[PDB]
Ligand binder design. Structure first.
Ligand SMILES: Nc1ncnc2c1ncn2[C@@H]1O[C@H](COP(=O)(O)OP(=O)(O)OP(=O)(O)O)[C@@H](O)[C@H]1O
Ligand SMILES: [Cl-]
Ligand SMILES: [Cl-]
Ligand SMILES: [Cl-]
Ligand SMILES: [Cl-]
Ligand SMILES: [Co+2]
Ligand SMILES: [Co+2]
Ligand SMILES: [Co+2]
Ligand SMILES: [Co+2]
Ligand SMILES: [Co+2]
Ligand SMILES: [Co+2]
Ligand SMILES: [Co+2]
Ligand SMILES: [Co+2]
Length: 492
């Protein structure tokens, strides 16, 4: 619900702090801002919220690009520090703000007990003196903050004289020695940037009364607040500190690791932006499984299908009636989607099949090799207990419909088969949500070496596809000697 929204006059803003990498929760915020802007044919601003001193701008902009979220203009909170100072002074002159040198603990217990600080009654001229001490960075100023004068007895703790301005000399941004708080800066900056609908998380809904109080007390143009719920996932860390620990201790080898909930992370993992947006629209800690099922339903109709077998469990099958001449046939990349085009299939008398499949056959069973035809299994050579080889006869014109058992396969053409590594990942932690390192899966990157069809040479980095009867994958990397690294996409 966007209050009084008018087509062509809606302005939202996405306000990420430029102190970290965007993650999936940020994505819900950025997407809802864009979605309401587009709904009303309006504008979405990008504001780097650097209100308090602590270069990720490029990462953030690149992730906004990758999600297809455009914005009309980029600004920084700090662009308005001058004007915020002016407004702080105006509020002192209206006796709506005062300089308080009370310590933090006693301020908090005074606030909890509705006790007005003795400084609440400071004169205007004294309040201004003390604000200037804060601006100059003196020890006097470092002892003081500026609070708003609202209502200490209010049932809303955010209306009990919230801090507006603080003296921060300790750390660099050293130009300013006092800084507005987020609670004071946000309504003011939203007003002066022309925001009409300021989106905000569910957490602390008490601050809306405060935000409106700042707007109206300064007689600024009104801004509506819309609220949405935070997006958080089970078995997922999103703290900056915890992610930092993972990286520094070589649990992952970068901040783009496909187990990370960063935007880069889960796009590398195979997620489409359409899947994320649709999940947000059609939906506390969420379960990943509906997100990955929506991804599966989105990607399955528009990705090619290839075959792969385990490079070392796979067993040799020989159709003894054929020769070693390699026959080539054109086939569809997608059986139900002719637009994805064709590739080349190659066959001979020698094949590789999966050992889990080969253990399931018995003499003179009829089965099907997908995209090729039927075969009659004749002999199972078991040397030293394990299956060593399977001999069968071609029956390519027999009816595959009469077969309950249809399997995938590779031609045994090793100078043409492409070697690949499958990376299957799991959650970095084991519980849903200080000894926390006791619950890390230090072994959540399972690798499998496989052969894949020659035609898979056609793929480019980041293409998605399906391995027959294996699952869904994204091409992450291409090695020297044409060796591919493929990440399994979860499918719910
Ligand atoms: N898990 C989440 N789900 C949805 N939106 C989020 C989530 N985390 C942050 N956001 C939204 O992302 C935007 C910027 O977040 P950022 O962390 O950069 O600022 P912040 O000051 O730390 O605010 P927050 O304390 O909410 O994270 C804000 O609109 C924020 O409310
Ligand atoms: Cl406080
Ligand atoms: Cl919501
Ligand atoms: Cl390691
Ligand atoms: Cl990596
Ligand atoms: Co339109
Ligand atoms: Co910066
Ligand atoms: Co000092
Ligand atoms: Co799971
Ligand atoms: Co020959
Ligand atoms: Co024939
Ligand atoms: Co595992
Ligand atoms: Co390698």
């Amino acid at each position: 619900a966007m209050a009084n929204a008018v087509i062509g006059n809606v302005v939202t803003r996405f306000p990420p702090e430029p102190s970290g990498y965007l993650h999936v929760g940020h994505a819900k915020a950025a997407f809802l801002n864009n979605y309401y802007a587009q709904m009303y044919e309006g504008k979405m601003l990008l504001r780097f919220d650097d209100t308090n001193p602590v270069k990720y701008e490029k990462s953030i902009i690149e992730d906004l690009e990758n999600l297809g979220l455009k914005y009309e203009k980029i600004s920084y909170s700090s662009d308005h520090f001058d004007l915020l100072e002016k407004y702080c002074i105006d509020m002192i002159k209206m006796n709506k703000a005062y300089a308080d040198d009370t310590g933090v603990e006693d301020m908090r217990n005074q606030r909890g007990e509705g006790i007005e600080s003795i400084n609440r009654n400071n004169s205007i001229e004294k309040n201004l003196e003390l604000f200037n001490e804060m601006r100059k960075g003196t020890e006097i100023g470092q002892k003081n903050c500026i609070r708003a004068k609202i209502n200490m007895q209010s049932k809303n703790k955010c209306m009990r004289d919230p801090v507006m301005y603080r003296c921060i000399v300790d750390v660099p941004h050293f130009k300013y020695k006092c800084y507005p708080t987020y609670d004071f800066a946000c309504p003011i900056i939203d007003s002066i940037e022309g925001v009409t609908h300021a989106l905000r998380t569910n957490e602390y809904s008490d601050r809306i009364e405060q935000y409106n109080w700042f707007i109206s007390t300064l007689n600024l143009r009104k801004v509506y607040i819309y609220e949405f719920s935070r997006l958080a996932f089970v078995k997922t860390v999103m703290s900056k500190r915890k992610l930092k620990w993972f990286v520094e201790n070589n649990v992952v080898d970068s901040w783009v690791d496909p187990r990370f909930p960063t935007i880069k992370g889960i796009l590398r993992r195979g997620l489409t932006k359409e899947a994320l947006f649709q999940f947000i629209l059609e939906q506390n800690l969420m379960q990943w499984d509906k997100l990955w099922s929506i991804n599966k339903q989105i990607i399955d109709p528009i990705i090619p299908r290839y075959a792969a077998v385990d490079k070392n469990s796979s067993i040799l099958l020989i159709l003894t009636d054929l020769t070693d001449q390699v026959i080539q046939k054109e086939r569809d990349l997608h059986m139900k989607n002719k637009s994805l085009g064709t590739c080349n299939m190659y066959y001979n008398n020698k094949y590789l099949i999966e050992l889990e499949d080969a253990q399931t056959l018995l003499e003179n069973e009829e089965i099907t090799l997908i995209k090729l035809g039927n075969i009659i299994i004749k002999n199972i050579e078991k040397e030293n207990g394990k299956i060593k080889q399977i001999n069968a006869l071609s029956n390519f014109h027999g009816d595959f419909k009469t077969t309950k058992k249809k399997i995938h396969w590779l031609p045994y053409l090793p100078q043409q088969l492409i070697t690949c590594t499958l990376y299957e990942y799991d959650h970095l932690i084991t519980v849903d949500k200080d000894d926390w390192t006791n619950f890390i899966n230090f072994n959540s990157k399972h690798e499998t070496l496989v052969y894949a069809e020659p035609s898979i040479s056609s793929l480019k980095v980041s293409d998605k596809f399906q391995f027959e009867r294996r699952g869904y994958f994204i091409l992450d990397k291409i090695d020297p000697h044409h060796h591919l690294h493929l990440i399994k996409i979860p499918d719910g």
